[PDB]
Amino acid sequence: DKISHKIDIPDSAWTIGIGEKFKNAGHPNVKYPMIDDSYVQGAPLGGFGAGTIGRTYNGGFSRWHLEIGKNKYTTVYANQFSVFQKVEGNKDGVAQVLYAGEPENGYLSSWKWDYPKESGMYYALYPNSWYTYTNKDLPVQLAVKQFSPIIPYNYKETSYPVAVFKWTAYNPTNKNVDVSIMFTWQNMIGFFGKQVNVNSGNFNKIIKDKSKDSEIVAAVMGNISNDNEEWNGEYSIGVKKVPGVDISYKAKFVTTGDGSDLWHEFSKNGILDNKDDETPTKQDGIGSAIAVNFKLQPGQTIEVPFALSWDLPIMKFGGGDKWYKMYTKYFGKNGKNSFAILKEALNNYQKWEKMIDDWQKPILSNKSKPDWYKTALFNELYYLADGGTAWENGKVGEKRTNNMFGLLECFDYNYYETLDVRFYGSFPLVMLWPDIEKQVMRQFADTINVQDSSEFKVGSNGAMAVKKVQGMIPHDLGSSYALPWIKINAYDWQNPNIWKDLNSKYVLLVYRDYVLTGKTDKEFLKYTWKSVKTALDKLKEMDKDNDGIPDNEGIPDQTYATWSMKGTSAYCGSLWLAALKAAQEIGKVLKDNEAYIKYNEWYKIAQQNFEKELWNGEYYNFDTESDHKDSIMADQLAGQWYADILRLGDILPKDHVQKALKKIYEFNVMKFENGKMGAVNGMRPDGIVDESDIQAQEVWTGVTYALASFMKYRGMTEEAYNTAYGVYKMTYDKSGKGYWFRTPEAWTKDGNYRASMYMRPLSIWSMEV
Ligand SMILES: OC[C@H]1O[C@@H](O[C@H]2[C@H](O)[C@@H](O)[C@H](O)O[C@@H]2CO)[C@H](O)[C@@H](O)[C@@H]1O
Ligand SMILES: [Ca+2]
């Protein structure tokens, strides 16, 4: 491995061998159907709202999120990098596809498949990933750095449907070596969004752009149609010329054939025919090929950049709504702009690299933090781009001031911006992309007073209920199978209009966003104030016994729905206390003196009653009226956790909070599988897991990272990192269950999971407040 010294892979990068098998991978622990795409994953490529492409550690372009809100796992085998090498003075060379595997069907059989094991590594520190190629039969060693320009406080490049592949090649041998690197890409127009004739009209063309300081050669893969539809647009691949390399290309080869039309050229001398065949296809799959060839003298290094772009301007949801994607603001909406995007990337990727280094460096250079934590902190951010992200730039067939945004809860539970989940999972947005965060919360503000009197069938019991109640915050802002932003509350399994935590979390989220963006944005507080007051006032009406706190009703009425709460609960109670104190402070800032006085009286009354009803001398009871009331909940003081973040001070006595957290650490962590798997949600005071409901027996990844941050703020440094460590281990480590780049909501004692690719674990960013 002489190539690793010649590139800058950080030590915290997640690593695995190319072609490595993994023996202990977990699977779903529920009886209903649930996604399991295996452990062959990688860091995604593509910006926010662009649609993402998951290239795996084996090198395949396999996890497709280009259809916004859908997860499609299938390797498009034609999409590859391939290498040709010949030692100078030798008659023949070798050619090899850089993919640890082979096609299932008989297509592309003439290509050299099955990149051997123990011959290279994959590395990932999102948004960067790397492949190294160190193979006995390849004299020249190769590495590629691949990324998309995901940059905090940048809402432009961060949106781009683009990837850069910066190759580095080094000759450690005593002889000159001829080397070719080739990028193949299938014309994927019609891969989604066409019932019939999936390839028909597809055509490829070569573009050459020589502009003194920059020669670029690119294949543009489009369609003859000018239909402005979900499926139509362009993919492009290309390369920038550098000193000492020459470029060759093949505009059209058949992907639904044996491949020899391309391979017989490339495997001969690593040089292609430069044939520019623009004729459309009818039934055959087609693709393009871009290759560079060069000669490396002994000890010589060369760097050559490739790029990939996809101009697919329109997203369509299942309800029929068609929206333009965010990036269209910068490149246009007509779907004929893939080359412009690619050219931007090939001429600016070095700037983008430095911008990425600039925002990672403060964390990476802090040597007081262990590398494992950085691996998790950065790689968890995969979900921002990969979570079915929707970022609109106008509805198809119409100007507008704001660009609505949606991140999914997950693909199995296909709901945009699920509020109770985003309470934990929105930390990276507020901290790194605050304008997006604020926009999402204004979307929620705008839903508060919406009334939908028509009824729906509640799935868990069968009872009918009102869709959307005035003054109650929605569970979500819709589904990709229906109408995001328009038809809210797509979730019907329970009735969110009776939930006791959503209104509180909403208020806490509003004030969080003000506090963590510098306490300067009064306009944001003004925009949201009516909704805040309404939300707390409607929740006050659910106080039955007149203790000043909303009553949980012993039925599904909060986040932990099936692990029911009754009476005053630690969870909803603490959130209520914190929300009231947050409302007080907004009151003071906006000079709404009556609101201030009101919420202050409500706060003091509820605070006293909370302490009296729930403090047992060691921790806070789960609730007042359940069968499982003395259970130790991991999330018992969620309100106080947010109050620390919001700099709202002590809603509960310091001494009591400290004891509760020590108890949670002693029990929920260290008495659950030796504290190597996170915090189990519920534990009985006898040191046995609360078995009243499945949820209680689950570790929730995002709850645990949140709990770690809470411990950290309260000076429990060792406990915080030990708690978080178990979540890292399960996700990323060889001893875990192989959930890298698909971190689930939950696992049980056995390490099997529920709901892979989940928003909540983004809560790890709360540890950086
Ligand atoms: O995991 C907590 C999370 O649950 C989500 O509801 C799931 C539920 O967990 C599952 O048991 C059921 O079969 O499916 C529903 C989705 O329809 C819920 O969306 C979240 O609010 C909650 O945080
Ligand atoms: Ca009450």
Residue numbers in the entry: 31 to 428, 431 to 801
Paper's wording?
The D593A and D593N unliganded enzymes and D593N complexes crystallized in the space group P21212, isomorphous, with wild-type TxGH116 crystals, whereas the crystals of TxGH116 D593A in complex with cellobiose and laminaribiose crystallized in the P212121 space group and had 2 molecules in one asymmetric unit. Comparison with the structure of the complex of D593A with cellobiose shows that in D593A the loop containing the catalytic acid/base, residues 585–596, is shifted and T591 does not interact with the nonreducing glucose residue while Y62 makes an addition interaction with the reducing end glucose residue. Nonetheless, the cellobiose is in a very similar position, suggesting no unusual effect on the substrate position is induced by hydrogen bonding to N593 in the D593N mutant. In each structure, the glucosyl residues at subsites –1 and +1 bind to the acid/base mutants in a relaxed 4C1 chair conformation.
